[PDB]
Design a protein around this ligand. Structure first.
Ligand code: ICS
Ligand code: CLF
Ligand code: CLF
Ligand SMILES: [Fe+3]
Ligand SMILES: [Fe+3]
Lengths: 477, 522, 522, 477
């Protein structure tokens, strides 16, 4: 459907760049074919961003501290380096938790070493040890400490692994060094890899010799769900209504004891493939734990995922799954009956990094909405392999898109709604186009599960059908 | 479960019985949570004076700081010039954080680019990154000037900005005549205001250092205004309005008000307004230069006095009655324009509001934090209203600034119980407001958590927060407010008196228990 | 007992144990108070729908009205003219109440005189009182004009204003050339806005009725602006600023902004600014006349169309987005002058704030009350924001206004759950907020008691009050705000969204109970 | 001092008026001579106001509804007539009370008949009866109704007495008709008189045949204390600490049962002579109850009053009085030690309607402050007889002062502080002179008793030594 026209637009947008930038960016733009299975033949991903083209990507510190390690509530995470990092990453991601902040819970706080010139010149290992002692003194109820390195830690010759070992042996405390310097990798994904490596190396094997935890055949661990707006909770109740026992969830509202007890479960339900497939494969290799991906965005994907998960178990779990589906059918049917007529036929362009862009399409299709263009800030070729069969014929695909490219694509295609990060929200609100911020979910939610689908539909309706969008043109002009 | 007619978001959806049962089972089964009595004991301990003594002995750990790093201020200074792109040499995560942080504060688009230095640059430097980034940015976003700051990466690896930009120009990546100012903004020295100062000094040096031969002081009959790190649009508006009412020729250098307040009318404007290159080139011809925030514009002051030969006045911030009066009198003396009657009437109206609200403002105790100049101006205004500042915190302040604030406090009987803290973070402030409880806090959004902790100790121990400063993330459109001059004093006075009255109404709303003082007229 | 270091006022010193014991002893001994169970039962009954059905069957009793009497509006109108003394013909207690009530709202001196009619006047009328009062006031306070209104006393006894003034003039008590316009303002008809309309119509008639021969429509190239009963000086200021920005010649009739905002500079100014007698005399020569609040300016509209022969446009109050646009377009059409770029940018910025706050403002339910024009403008703006007004009350409203508001509601899907009430009081509104709970109320200070009652039913039933309207007694300097134009819409939007966010922060401040949703960024 | 200067100043201020107004207002201004105990030979009061001179006086309705009857918490007071009267007087006076508003207490509520044209033309008695029925329907826990007449009620010949009698007999309810029309009298004083007469006629004698109340020889009734900011409460504790039992409290926080029980007390302690001397004399004549005036403004006056009151009883009450004085001595001594050095030598001018211009002098002298001028709105010659002995020689006295007169007097004397009502506050704040509202205490207090003295001293200090008063002159003039 107008595949040549999408290809033409790509060329006209590429015309502006210099030759090297154009040649690099041409490989990150594609027209989707549902029949193509290998995405490497059409789109390139996981590459360095071109200098000075205003990318959306973050750093490895954001992928490790801000995504994987931050949601762990009972541990204290130290931003090792200058003050800016933890300050800009403090409480910006809505990873929800239950606890007494400052006493047993520390997600929303900013622990930092705050280097000055002298720490840069003479190193900061002694200062890190003194900081660890001060943390122990002032925060006795913590259950572990993580040391998230920033750029100078890698640049200067700090060795925080030995300090972590010595202090942990001295204090009988789990101290996990994470070399997540922002200049490593090209995006947040290598931060995910480094964080998972740290998890396997320092935390995961504490209770390997311990067999005091009673286990049941119905033990699963939720992996890769960070409880954004409560999302993980909305999933967990469903799994507990199906007759399953959720030992751990990674890592929203997560505790270190849950991570240590994870190797005792019978199944690993991985929600975010991109950030936790590493630890999932490690557990499959070392403990024999099978892991499977699932989707809880929209009633259709939720029902399919529940049925598959129950198929991994015996007949009683399957019967409970059928009971849960029958119980929740009228609610999402009412949601559909109320909101589909006001969203049918609308077109959406989504830019998000890693899992979300192909992973929320089913919920839009449940509302009768068509995604015409989907993009990933830092995904890999396997994510696009899933995306191509997830998306429709002649749709736009785009990896690590620049601001100019995305603005031109939006001007040409003219969608009714854009789902993207805040750095795009106000740009496209001033363009007269409804915008929904997927990462914080416009500070609403949750959207996972049956209870989340209602909120999702309500929010899409309230933003798309907003009376403000008809008032940007002055009556005299 | 969800009712289609009344759908609940996370609050109060997770207050349902099934969700509470789920959370209780989760906590009891797998979290290994500490007992509630131990948690309560530890919290009560952390609200004590012994915990405060332990907290103030910290030397290596910083908990909940109230400052940022230099390139943020550099970017904000750079955004104040006409059709100019902020270019940050280093790693892209820094730019992502800067953009998101300013987007959450101003709720407006913020444009900034990086050259995306990686592990390869850690051993070869960033010459090629600089060349390609400059060429790509100029070709793509068509800016007239590129103002270049640094991340801590390039600062540690010792990248030479001048050599990089020169080699980019001589090899044809960018035109030779094309304006590319630079400034080293290392994150482990100073704070964001220091980055603003460095960026402005770099731009001024780029435009004026090599063309001082034909410059004559005072030949353009204007006064240069350097605002500094300022996240209130109303301050730029009010400074221009006050200078225009006096009929005073002026030049506001680094004016970002238009680019951060663009209208929503169906198009996206990446650039809007800002100081022109002609204004910067003609600045040395002004009568003098006024620094609105001297305590973090020291390098700018040194360059202005050494090179432009302007006798920069020793003025405080124009916050509050006396210092606004002093600023106006200095401007009148420099320009020769008499103070108009409209400003006199505005000052009289502010005095009238002070007389009206003095009974409710008298004796109130405030904890407070922010940037040095804003903190000292706010303390001055609080002393002018008869209020008592108790805990004065400035994480990025220095000893000279502390001495000046102490001298200001000694000049008023309402500063007898005040203490100034420098280098302390918000955990120190939490201890201070637990052990010596003030009536209110004045600060940015990060103080909200502190308020929460107080409410956990008890309603009678709760310290309400007043959102004045940067950043404000949990309220809408407060960046449009004003804190400078008579108008800013009026706004802050209204906010203070109405917060006090709202707290009084909350305390007195109890039927047949405290509602005897729930007066209709206050 | 009082500690000299920390002295307690009524709250919370009456919360001490000895005072509590005293009050309990008094109640149990001599007050013969009803048992607490009976009181709770009666209150719970008053929260019910059956009580609402009984409450709306009222025909003779009024509890807690939301309107005043005519001479108050007459005084407000009269203060809008230069060096004009308000003169209320009747009893002095009325003048004392008017002065105190305006003093508590505006927090400024408010001048008015009475002729102090007594039982002797109640028998023989008030000729002598009028003569002596006119002479005394002119000799003592030296006004340029004296505007005469009436209390219900003189209205019941049928005192003839025209005859009394004429007899006073021909007997030499005041010069024949001294302007003494008059208006009958019966308090048992209409409300304060009706008094404003009557006073303005009287003044306009006095200055223009007998000099229409030499008047040519449009010969002074100006537009007359009549604001009506207005208690926000910001509204006058924003109208004048918008007209000056457009370069429109205008004459603001009855402009009291200066006399209600005099500076505190060491002297008392009884008169300040105001509409001149020359402006009123030249008013028939304007191109046209604009009434900002047509729903209480009907008599003046009849006079202006019938005598000045001005084709008064059919415009609503310039509140919100679309009605401000219509007002600006009508002004541009009448004056033949284009709309400048500054106003377009301001409108775009208002639209930008709307798009920024739409997610938090969507679907919220509001009860609201006030004067007709203000109520309908607020309802229109709320519909423009995507909000849902549910209980719309206007005590001083009529049936045609009700149809107009119903027509406005029917044009929007967001007004489907809205009912319009005229002639109902705040006790009806209390019943409505208890039986069909909205998210917020919007009204004057009298709504605070309503909030109290809802808080007594429970925290989950409390309806917060937002103070927009007249009068506001329990907050300081809110009379400086603006409701008209893009500026007023911006202020209203900011207040609404931040009230919503403040309530959300209050509901999620409990640690480990609801603080999971205590988000830093909103 | 300078009596001759004061008289010459009075003449120059007098010059502006016309001949008739000049002759009348000349009799109302005077120079105090403490030796002169007959005020009639020196000053005239309680006369009609001259038209057009902007007087401060109120009306009879304010004297009855807003002062005497309004504080009665368990009764409902209907403002009979048009709407403005009760709206301007609603909750404007801080007559504090304990109760559940809208259920058993109705002080801050506005009940009115809200006449239209038809009620004026055809009368409003039927509307009054229907209103009484509706009041009984929606407010069942009310214990009595008062009907406060406004000007049209007296001007249209409505018969509220017959309606009140019929409805009271029908409903077994106490309905008190009050003919407090604003045109009656010259000020609030006749409102006081009418209110006391109606209390005598319809309320006071209901329990004459009732003897079930147990009485003690220590029974006192506080008369003429309206609990402004809790004033009466701060009084009652002291009386209860002295060993007395306070049956009733007229009328702040007062109840109708307390008024009915009042004829059973042994002593009537009158604070406000001006508003309650009528009922005090009536009760002395009818029940033989003695009454005495007291003053609880400032430590000296309250100590004198407590000793004089205890002198009326046996020796145990005297011993308890001395114990109370000894207990409270250090507190007010500390208050004096803290605040008198800040207020020593300051001069004050006062203008309040009755009684208070003279009772607040003692506390000002207790803080070492001099009252150089005082006056009343609606006092009688007896009030001035009491006043002249308590003021200094050659101090200014003035009755029903006009705005112009008081402004000129303040300009010439130049006092350090002015204590008056809300209609002078902003006038004299704009002139650069500190102002204290002496009707509502600037929304603070109470000022009665030892506890009130501390608040009074703190308020006077905070207003008089406010830094804002040193900033009205801009530095460039
Ligand atoms: S972890 Fe990843 S960018 Fe999988 S770094 Fe990012 S809370 Fe996104 S699309 Mo912010 S791979 Fe999670 C993500 Fe997805 S922070 Fe959240 S929204 S599902
Ligand atoms: S890519 Fe990532 S966010 Fe950037 S620094 Fe590197 S780890 Fe950190 Fe923190 S301090 Fe500031 S923001 Fe940087 S420049 Fe020095
Ligand atoms: S002296 Fe006193 S206050 Fe005056 S009316 Fe008379 S009783 Fe009343 Fe109410 S309604 Fe308005 S204010 Fe009057 S003019 Fe008709
Ligand atoms: Fe915006
Ligand atoms: Fe004022």
């Amino acid at each position: 459907m107008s595949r040549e026209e999408v290809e033409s637009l790509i060329q006209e947008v590429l015309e502006v760049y210099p030759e090297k930038a154009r040649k690099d960016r041409n490989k990150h733009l594609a027209v989707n074919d549902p029949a193509v299975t290998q995405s490497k033949k059409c789109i390139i991903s996981n590459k360095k961003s071109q200098p000075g083209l205003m990318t959306i990507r973050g750093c490895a510190y954001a992928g490790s501290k801000g995504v994987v390690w931050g949601p762990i509530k009972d541990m204290i995470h130290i931003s090792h380096g200058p003050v800016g990092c933890g300050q800009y990453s403090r409480a910006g991601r809505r990873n929800y938790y239950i606890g007494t902040t400052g006493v047993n819970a520390f997600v929303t706080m900013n622990f930092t070493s705050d280097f000055q010139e002298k720490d840069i010149v003479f190193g900061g290992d002694k200062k890190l040890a003194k900081l660890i002692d001060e943390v122990e003194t002032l925060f006795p109820l913590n259950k572990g400490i993580s040391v998230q390195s920033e750029c100078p830690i890698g640049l200067i010759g700090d060795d925080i692994e030995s300090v972590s070992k010595v202090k942990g042996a001295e204090l009988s405390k789990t101290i996990v060094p994470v070399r997540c310097e922002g200049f490593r990798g090209v995006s947040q994904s290598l931060g995910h890899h480094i964080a998972n490596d740290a998890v396997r190396d320092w935390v995961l094997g504490k209770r390997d010799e311990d067999t005091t935890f009673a286990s049941t055949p119905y033990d699963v661990a939720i992996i890769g769900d960070y409880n954004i707006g409560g999302d993980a909770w909305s999933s967990r109740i469903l799994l507990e209504e199906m007759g399953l026992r959720c030992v751990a969830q990674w890592s929203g509202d997560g505790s270190i004891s849950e991570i240590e007890l994870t190797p005792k479960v019978k199944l690993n339900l991985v929600h975010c493939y991109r950030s936790m497939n590493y630890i999932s494969r490690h557990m499959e290799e070392k403990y024999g734990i099978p892991w499977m991906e699932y989707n809880f965005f929209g009633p259709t994907k939720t029902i399919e995922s529940l049925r598959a998960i129950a198929a991994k178990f015996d007949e009683s779990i399957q019967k409970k799954c059928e009971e849960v589906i029958a119980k929740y059918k009228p609610e999402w049917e009412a949601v559909v009956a109320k909101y589909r007529p006001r969203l049918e036929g609308k077109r959406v362009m989504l830019y998000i990094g890693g899992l979300r862009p192909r992973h929320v399409i089913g919920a839009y299709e449940d509302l009768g909405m068509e995604v015409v263009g989907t993009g990933y800030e830092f995904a890999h070729n396997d994510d696009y392999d899933r995306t191509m069969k997830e998306m429709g014929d002649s749709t736009l695909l785009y990896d690590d898109v620049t601001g100019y490219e995305f603005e031109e694509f939006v001007k040409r295609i003219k969608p009714d709604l854009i789902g993207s990060g805040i750095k795009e929200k106000f740009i496209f609100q001033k363009m007269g186009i409804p915008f929904r911020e997927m990462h914080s979910w416009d500070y609403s939610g949750p959207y996972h599960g049956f209870d989340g689908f209602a909120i999702f539909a309500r929010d899409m309706d309230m933003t798309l059908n907003n009376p403000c969008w008809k008032k940007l043109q002055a009556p005299w002009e | 479960s969800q009712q289609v007619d009344k759908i609940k978001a996370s609050y109060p959806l997770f207050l349902d019985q099934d969700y509470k049962d789920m959370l209780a089972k989760k906590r009891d089964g797998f979290e290994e949570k500490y007992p509630q009595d131990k948690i309560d004991e530890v919290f009560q301990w952390t609200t004590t004076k012994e915990y405060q003594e332990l907290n103030f002995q910290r030397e290596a750990l910083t908990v909940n700081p109230a400052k940022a790093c230099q390139p943020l201020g550099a970017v904000l200074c750079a955004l104040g010039f006409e059709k100019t792109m902020p270019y940050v040499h280093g790693s892209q995560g820094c730019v992502a954080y800067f953009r998101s942080y300013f987007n959450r504060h101003f709720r407006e688009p913020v444009s900034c680019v990086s050259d995306s230095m990686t592990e390869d640059a850690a051993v070869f430097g960033g010459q090629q990154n600089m060349k390609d980034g400059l060429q790509n940015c100029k070709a793509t976003y068509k800016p007239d000037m590129i103002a270049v700051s640094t991340t801590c990466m390039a600062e540690v690896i010792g990248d030479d900005l001048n050599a990089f930009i020169n080699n980019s120009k001589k090899e044809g990546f960018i035109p030779d005549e094309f304006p590319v100012p630079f400034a080293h903004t290392p994150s482990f020295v100073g704070s964001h205001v220091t980055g603003w100062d460095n960026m402005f000094e770099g731009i001024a040096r780029y435009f004026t250092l090599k063309s001082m031969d034909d410059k004559v002081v005072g030949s353009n009959k204007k006064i240069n205004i350097v605002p500094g790190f300022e996240t209130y649009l109303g301050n730029f508006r009010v400074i221009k309005r006050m200078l225009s009412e006096m009929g005073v020729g002026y030049s506001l250098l680094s004016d970002p008000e238009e680019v951060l307040d663009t209208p929503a009318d169906g198009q996206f404007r990446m650039y809007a307004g800002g100081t022109t290159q002609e204004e910067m080139k003609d600045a040395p011809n002004a009568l003098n230069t006024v620094l609105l925030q001297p305590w973090h514009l020291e390098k700018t002051k040194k360059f202005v006095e050494g090179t432009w030969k302007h006798e920069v006045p020793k003025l405080n911030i124009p916050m509050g009655l006396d210092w606004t009066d002093e600023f106006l009198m200095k401007v009148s003396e420099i320009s020769g324009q008499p103070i108009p009657a409209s400003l006199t009437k505005e000052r009289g109206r502010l005095v009238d509001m002070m007389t009206d609200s003095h009974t409710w403002l008298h004796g109130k105790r405030f904890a407070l934090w922010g940037d040095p100049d804003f903190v000292m101006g706010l303390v001055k205004f609080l002393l002018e209203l008869g209020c008592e500042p108790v805990h004065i915190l400035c994480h990025n302040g220095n000893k000279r600034w502390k001495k000046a604030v102490d001298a200001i406090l000694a000049a008023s009987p309402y500063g007898k119980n005040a203490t100034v803290y420098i280098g302390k973070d918000l955990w120190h402030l939490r201890s201070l407001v637990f052990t010596d409880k003030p009536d209110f806090m004045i600060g940015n959004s990060y103080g909200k958590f502190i308020q929460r902790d107080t409410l956990h100790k008890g309603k009678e121990f709760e310290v309400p927060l007043i959102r004045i400063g940067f950043p404000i993330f949990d309220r809408h459109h407060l960046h449009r407010s004003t804190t400078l001059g008579y108008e800013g004093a009026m706004q802050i006075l209204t906010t203070l008196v109405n917060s006090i009255l709202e707290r009084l109404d909350e305390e007195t709303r109890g039927m047949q228990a405290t509602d005897y003082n729930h007066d209709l007229v206050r």
